[PDB]
Amino acid sequence: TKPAIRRLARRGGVKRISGLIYEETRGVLKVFLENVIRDAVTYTEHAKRKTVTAMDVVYALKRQGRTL
Amino acid sequence: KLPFSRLVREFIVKYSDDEPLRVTEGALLAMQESCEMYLTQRLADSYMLTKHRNRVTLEVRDMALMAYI
């Protein structure tokens, strides 16, 4: 939504934001999430289990580099 | 929850094989926390470029240099 992006900007110290950020921000995140969910789903299904746990999310985050 | 569940559902189904993959609240909340801070981090770093550019408006200009790196 528009205020969730605003809320994220204000958390980061951003005061005012341009209108393309809204679409650009969703795209950037999906890339991140695609890796998190993909990795989590791939590990969770492969690893003798079929349920995503908090640690599977943790496993996906380690596998990022867009964190480091 | 509305745009988070969509993406989770789309990608669990997209990246499933024989079936969607259950999941717990802690898993969902843990993911959601992680993803929020990733956008906070990258917007804030791009905002560091904004101040370096003598501007006050975070723009797609600033998002792109961190994204290029």
Author numbering:
A (entry chain B): 31 to 98
B (entry chain A): 50 to 118
What text comes from the article?
To preserve centromere identity, CENP‐A must be escorted to centromeres by a CENP‐A‐specific chaperone for deposition. Instead, fly‐specific CAL1 appears to combine the roles of both HJURP and the Mis18 complex: pre‐nucleosomal CENP‐A recognition and its targeting to the centromere for deposition, respectively (Phansalkar et al, 2012). In this study, we present the structural basis for the recognition of CENP‐A/H4 and CENP‐C by CAL1.
Extensive crystallisation trials with CAL11–160–CENP‐A101–225–H4 and CAL11–160–CENP‐A144–225–H4 yielded two different crystal forms: form I that diffracted X‐rays to about 3.5 Å and form II that diffracted anisotropically to about 4.4 Å. The difference electron density map calculated using the molecular replacement solution revealed unambiguous density for most main chain atoms of CAL11–160. CAL11–160 is almost entirely made of α helices that make multiple contacts with CENP‐A/H4 heterodimer by wrapping around it. Most CENP‐A contacts are made by CAL1 helices α1 and α2 and loop L1, which interact with the CENP‐A helices α2, α1 and loop L1, respectively, involving a total interface area of about 940 Å2. CAL1 L1 crosses over CENP‐A L1 to facilitate CAL1 α2 interaction with CENP‐A α3. Strikingly, unlike other histone chaperones, CAL1 shields CENP‐A α3 through downstream α helical elements. When compared to the available “histone variant”—chaperone complex crystal structures, the overall mode of CENP‐A/H4 recognition by CAL1 appears to be novel as it is the only one which wraps around CENP‐A/H4 through multiple CENP‐A and H4 contacts resulting in the shielding of CENP‐A/H4 surfaces involved in CENP‐A/H4 tetramerisation, DNA binding and H2A/H2B binding—all critical for nucleosome assembly.
